[model samples]
Target: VSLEQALKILKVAAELGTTVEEAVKRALKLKTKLGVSLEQALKILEVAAELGTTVEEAVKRALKLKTKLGVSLEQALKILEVAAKLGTTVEEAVKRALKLKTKLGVSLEQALKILKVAAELGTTVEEAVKRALKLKTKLGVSLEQALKILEVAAELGTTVEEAVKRALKLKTKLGVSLEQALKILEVAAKLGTTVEEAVKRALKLKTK
Candidate 1:
């Protein structure tokens, strides 16, 4: 949806204190209205609720970041999410994202993702960047790959080193590729089971 239409809907929604769906319906019914799908409207509402701000305010903040960072609307929303989680303003988050981009030699998207990781891990952005770089070097993977692995590790309640070690073991023992081994670990993580149990079950199914 265009920012103009979204802001209009948000303003109406806040003024009426009604459901977002109702607000959209009302906005669309108005003469000054543009077009926005229900799905797009809902996404805006979701972000607004998450940030505990009016929809108009949320879009305005995101628009500011979108212009300043040369990022898409989606990326701007994500940056706002990160900013809210980090208890900082969008401006501060943008500064951090730019600093990380230059210091880590990563893209803005990657920098934002790293900042998200820091927020989730309850660590500083500097610390998360350090861990990401260290993990990349140790695993011989790209920075992006390392960040992904770290995310999976965090989800599984394990350290990156242990997760990689388990994947390596599965790689050699099952005579599978690293990608396949990581898939198995991914499955284990999803099922909330130990890697050993996941492998054992896979072998059992293979034998059966």
Candidate 2:
């Protein structure tokens, strides 16, 4: 491995309560056993480092998952990568991945999108997806509508559910369209007023 990669791995190993040599040896052993390139082995270690997990732990989990889930080595790498990117433990990612597959019947692409959106929204994938799905059902809205509400909430630095609740109240109470509701939220935000206050002012203005 290059010195930079070595240094990175060494730092992570130190944090994981191991030495650089031990981490290198462990990654080397896996590289040999799995017939992966040195670069691929480094990637595995890199992911472990990012997640604050041990290289051995990630590999052990990957091995079991490869066998049990009938996935390829690269696919195993991807699963770990997802966990690493989310800053979650390997085990928790496994559970969430399984649930996304079995429970939600979510495709890999869908799962990746969920993770991306959750990251963007500064929330968990479970929460983002759950709130989006719930709001869609409750409001008889489309995915685009659900995402619009989520994006608005994220922009406002609040929870998606909270924003959806307010937007729904606006639509239901004032008989506003989706666009109109978002406009009210935007103007209320700019004017430093509450949605309720904005709506009342808007209605009062309409009487003229």
Candidate 3:
């Protein structure tokens, strides 16, 4: 039977208060007996439904998604769903997703998260990924650290680039952690002194 038809029957069976496993078992009697989990069966059905193809064809395409994207079956399904939502073909979506992954040096999941963040920030995924890469290269910090530094910079009314530069200086010159360097910056802001001066004062106080 076609996956589309099978999905409809399974969905109807679910609506009729029959468990999906039972419905699957009934639909493909020998296949269920061969040890296919209900979850895997549902995934197959959903993929076939989305692809508008037969179960065998869906399995083949699903394997392709997993191999090409280096993603789990669930992640592949998410990519397909996102492609549908964006009015794009699965092939096109895979290309963009792969580009994002390679560009950011992140996993498929992180690339997708970046895509969502880019949407919320009203920028393209490429722009957001580029910014993250730039920050990483400049400050030697991960995207997560860069974002935290930006937050700290905003609170201190300093630019993020400058903040990162100063933090790195404090970390290397004074042999302090990045977190400690940020704390020194906060202290410098509060004490109305340069970061170096604040570090000197802190050192003197520690000696005394």
Give the winner by TM-score: 1
Candidate ranking (TM-score, best to worst): 1, 2, 3
lDDT of 1 by residue, 85-191 (tens): 88898889888989989986889888888998888888887888888889878778877667767776887788888878877887788777666666567656655
**lDDT for every model?**
0.69, 0.66, 0.61
Error of 2 at 67 (Å): 0.7
Predicted structure 1: clash tally: 0
Worst 10 residues of 1 by lDDT: 2-11
Native-referenced Cα lDDT, model 1:
0.69
Q: For candidate 2, which ten residues in a row score worst on lDDT? A: 1-10
Report the lDDT tens digits of candidate 3 across residue range 58-166.
6666668889878777677667655754467777776777797887577766665566445434567777667666777886876755545644575578787788888
lDDT of 3: 0.61
Candidate 3 TM-score to native: 0.36
- Candidate 1 off by > 4 Å: 1-69, 165-208
Model 2 lDDT, residue 23, Cα: 64
lDDT of 2 at 56: 78
